[PDB]
Design a protein around this ligand. Structure first.
Ligand SMILES: Nc1nc(Nc2ccc(S(N)(=O)=O)cc2)sc1C(=O)c1cccc(F)c1
Length: 294
């Protein structure tokens, strides 16, 4: 914008670019997302306004929304690092389990909160989970297709990551449920533990089949109605479910039990964020502080 001094480009959001910026008058440092001509939906901005009144310690605060000049700017409180960079920086030693547990616990609180407010994230991934020196982690870049849409590109030729997409989405479900966020978080949880993406698909079908090769090709037994889904094909190969202890070694049984519930094929059997918070895995949860190199 004009009242902002771009310090540097932080990346590519889901609808545009993200800059670290400084409010030329207040001096506050923020994250500024620039969106996109048609004219911007009203149904969108209102689903956005909802996002403004969404205040929780594990949700990145959306400070302002400016529509002017055939471009949409979203001003967010700024955090210094995303989980993707942190995981990469921790690849050699791995993130300590107490920190992994604390982050998962906080993200479930964040989700429990948005979900109870009928708000879905829709596109959780390490790049949109932000952390601070304080040991907090927050949900960022909500993709609400109800606040806009779920396109095939961010805005200008970018390879969308499908690694965290719930199977029901890949199978053509038109109406996502809060369960899609639990699935994505489950994938992230596994990745923090093993230091390797759980399902690194390179295409929608490869994504689907990597899920199938690991969790078993779903059928009507484990997922009633799956064979009636839009993109389900009787021709899908039939892979057996892999031993789960091979999936996330060396995560303890409480952790594996919880991940297992976050990765249930049936959206209705998949654990809710509220229930996951009560899982025995969190009995000894604490809030360690990360070693952040900024
Ligand atoms: N609030 C906020 N802060 C950020 N800082 C930051 C600082 C450093 C790093 S990094 N690669 O670790 O050096 C990453 C993010 S991004 C962001 C967003 O709200 C956001 C995130 C994703 C997409 C989007 F559209 C907006």
């Amino acid at each position: 914008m004009e009242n902002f001094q771009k310090v540097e480009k932080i990346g590519e959001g889901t609808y545009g670019v993200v800059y670290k910026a400084r409010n030329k008058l207040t001096g506050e440092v923020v994250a500024l997302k620039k969106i996109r001509t048609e004219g911007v939906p009203s149904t969108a901005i209102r689903e956005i306004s909802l996002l403004k009144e969404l205040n929780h310690p594990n949700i990145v605060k959306l400070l302002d929304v400016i529509h002017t000049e055939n471009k949409l700017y979203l001003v967010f409180e700024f955090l210094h690092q995303d989980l993707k960079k942190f995981m990469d920086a921790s690849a050699l030693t791995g993130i300590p389990l107490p920190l992994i547990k604390s982050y998962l616990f906080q993200l479930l609180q964040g989700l429990a909160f948005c979900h109870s407010h009928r708000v879905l994230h829709r596109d959780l991934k390490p790049q949109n989970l932000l952390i601070n020196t304080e040991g907090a982690i927050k949900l960022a870049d909500f993709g609400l297709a109800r606040a806009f849409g779920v396109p095939v590109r961010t805005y200008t030729h970018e390879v969308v990551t499908l690694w965290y997409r719930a199977p029901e989405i890949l199978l053509g479900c038109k109406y996502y449920s809060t369960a899609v966020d639990i699935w994505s978080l489950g994938c992230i949880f596994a990745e923090m533990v093993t230091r390797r993406a759980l399902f690194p698909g390179d295409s929608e079908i490869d994504q689907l089949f990597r899920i199938f090769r690991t969790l078993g090709t779903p059928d009507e037994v484990v997922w009633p109605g799956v064979t009636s889904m839009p993109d389900y094909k009787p021709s899908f190969p039939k892979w057996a479910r892999q031993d789960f202890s091979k999936v996330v070694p060396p995560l303890d049984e409480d952790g594996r039990s919880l991940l297992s519930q976050m990765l249930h094929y049936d959206p209705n059997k998949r654990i809710s964020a509220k229930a996951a918070l009560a899982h025995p895995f969190f009995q000894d949860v604490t809030k360690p502080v990360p070693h952040l190199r900024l």
